Amino acid sequence: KVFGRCELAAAMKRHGLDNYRGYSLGNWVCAAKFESNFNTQATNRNTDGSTDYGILQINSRWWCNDGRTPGSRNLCNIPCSALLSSDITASVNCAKKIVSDGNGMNAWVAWRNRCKGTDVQAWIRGCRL
Ligand SMILES: O=C(O)c1cc(-n2cc(CO)nn2)cc(C(=O)O)n1
Ligand SMILES: O=C(O)c1cc(-n2cc(CO)nn2)cc(C(=O)O)n1
Ligand SMILES: O=C(O)c1cc(-n2cc(CO)nn2)cc(C(=O)O)n1
Ligand SMILES: O=C(O)c1cc(-n2cc(CO)nn2)cc(C(=O)O)n1
Ligand SMILES: [Cl-]
Ligand SMILES: [Cl-]
Ligand SMILES: [Cl-]
Ligand SMILES: [Cl-]
Ligand SMILES: [Cl-]
Ligand SMILES: [Cl-]
Ligand SMILES: [Eu+3]
Ligand SMILES: [Eu+3]
Ligand code: NA
Ligand code: NA
């Protein structure tokens, strides 16, 4: 599923990501735009042989099982394919664990380089939330 911007903002808010660990909703929407273009089916392979999955590009090296990242962990205790669903519940619940691990949203490279420090509220401007 390719979400619209406000559609995804509403879903993330309903799932409790607005201000989670102090990160306002616009930070999450910005991160998802540049990680996945709001496409739940996005996948990208990393240099180490892990893969990033879903709207927030969650990595199989640490967070989910894909069966092909030998030596990896599965700290969200989920198959990586759950992160590709049109329902973002699994991606949100796993993201909550990632952003709590000590490094905040720096875990997301696109957030660090394209969202951090910017006017992220612009990403939810005009939405009825
Ligand atoms: O493709 C776009 O740029 C786009 C698409 C949508 N979409 C809205 C929906 C709902 O059915 N799907 N895409 C919203 C926006 C926007 O708020 O700027 N922008
Ligand atoms: O209506 C929109 O949501 C929309 C429209 C355009 N359009 C761009 C052009 C060409 O000038 N026409 N609509 C771009 C975007 C976007 O980049 O999010 N979004
Ligand atoms: O917190 C992370 O997972 C993270 C943070 C950084 N950061 C690097 C800097 C400063 O240059 N800030 N976070 C890089 C990486 C990575 O290569 O996977 N990962
Ligand atoms: O006006 C639009 O169509 C629009 C504007 C932005 N904006 C994104 C930013 C952040 O720099 N400001 N407007 C995003 C989108 C979209 O994601 O579809 N769409
Ligand atoms: Cl929308
Ligand atoms: Cl915001
Ligand atoms: Cl594996
Ligand atoms: Cl393969
Ligand atoms: Cl599994
Ligand atoms: Cl933080
Ligand atoms: Eu648009
Ligand atoms: Eu990292
Ligand atoms: Na906000
Ligand atoms: Na699993």
Please, what are the domains in the chain? Answer: 1-129 (1.10.530.10)
**82 C-alpha to center of ligand 14: Å?**
9
User: What's the resolution in A?
Assistant: 1.4
Which residue's C-alpha comes closest to atom 4 of ligand 3? 107
Count CA atoms closer than 13 A to 116's CA, side-chain side.
Answer: 10
First to last CA, the chain: 20
Catalytic (active site) residue 7: no
Burial class (CB in 10 A: 0-12, 13-18, 19+), 4: exposed
Cα–Cα distance measured from residue 115 to residue 104, given in angstroms and rounded to the nearest whole number:
13
| Side chain identity at residue 119, one-letter code | D
Ligand that comes closest to the CA of residue 13? 13
